[PDB]
């Protein structure tokens, strides 16, 4: 197992796949600066399309509780229905 | 584990979330006053965005059983048809 | 364990519910009485809204073959549809 | 565990529920014949509203071979799409 | 258990089907000739609706690669969304 | 078990088909040379229509990265809405 190899599974709650994300980078061996950096970048890059979406819309300076609270409402009935809605609207 | 990290999952039903609160809060080391506290904030902060939505109609002054009764219908076919409907047409 | 805390499920079938609710009743320690008088407000009173709309229209009376039967519907293909169908009218 | 608490699931299988059915009904103490009337009344009875639908179609004479044959489209594509259509039609 | 007994259920994909079909078939005690036999007519025979859709529109002289690479896409949610607008244009 | 029976399933994430088809290439019998090779035509050709569609969209020269971050859509809600949208507009 390695960091790079934790990606985000298409219907995988944020929640979850961030507690992978971090009980795997607390395992590799590397410099503590290093897996700060590792977490800004890969955490977000390995994220499925739909949450890579709203953290980009969230934009810089957001803290792990800001993501994950804007994010546990993909998969929800309201999530699905607006995106369906809105992708019937762009067709 | 930690009282702060319990989230409800999107998918996840009202009853189990507050059931894994309420295990974890029995845990947690603190006064019984910070427990009580811990509950009214925590556990309506931490649930998903359909049930905080219902929750946030609620008002407060609620207990455990109104808004358990309150949000049991999220992910039922009448909740999910009607979030459907209401989506379509806000779009 | 208690009598007062079985809750159906969002998405739980009926059958099931009810198999919950009197394995535990028969461990709830209280009169045979007061476990009939528990059986006719509780298990109405804790079923999800999808249910407890079926069993509000079928009104008292009722025995439990009559309300299973008219609840197993529920999440069916036609079940859904049909609550689709009607939310799309109402909006 | 008794034949007559046999009932379909809303989204049960067919070949599933019948499974059930002859595994329980071999465990009951009852004649022969017993058995084999409770096969043609509970059978068809205990099933949910959807195959209910397609053996009352079907009629008298069936056997199981036709009907698990008639049956296992069933929260298939194919139905679930029918089945939304045709109800969409109605309203 | 017996090979004729072997039915693809609804929502089985058709890898795992056949998998169990000649799981199956390796344990029935019969000639290599009728086992040959019963593969060509069961296995096309008593697959779900959708599957035999489109074996049939396959035709004969398929191997199980052109089958099952013909099959794959059941479920798969180009699938649904074909099947599904081609029943909304049905009705 | 063999690679050629190695395929991917119609709900499988493209993540997990990989996986799967990277652990049995590194057991069955043969040179690496020709274990490359089998990477590159099975684990596209044994893939579902979906991702055969997008992968087919990338085109040659593409690494397993960019394969695997172009197909985590699949499933996702976004996904199944804009496939569903299109579908819609093409019937």
């Not at 395992?27 to 709203?54: F, G, R, Y």
Request: proline share 5%; with cysteine; hydrophobic share 35%.
């Amino acid at each position: 197992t390695s960091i790079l190899d934790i990606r985000q599974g298409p219907k995988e709650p944020f929640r979850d796949y961030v507690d992978r994300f971090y009980k795997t980078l607390r395992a590799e061996q590397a410099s503590q600066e290093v897996k700060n950096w590792m977490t800004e970048t890969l955490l977000v890059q390995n994220a499925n399309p739909d949450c890579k979406t709203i953290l980009k819309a969230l934009g810089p300076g957001a803290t792990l509780e800001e993501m994950m609270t804007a994010c546990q409402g993909v998969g929800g009935p309201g999530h699905k229905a607006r995106v369906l809605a809105e992708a019937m609207s762009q067709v």
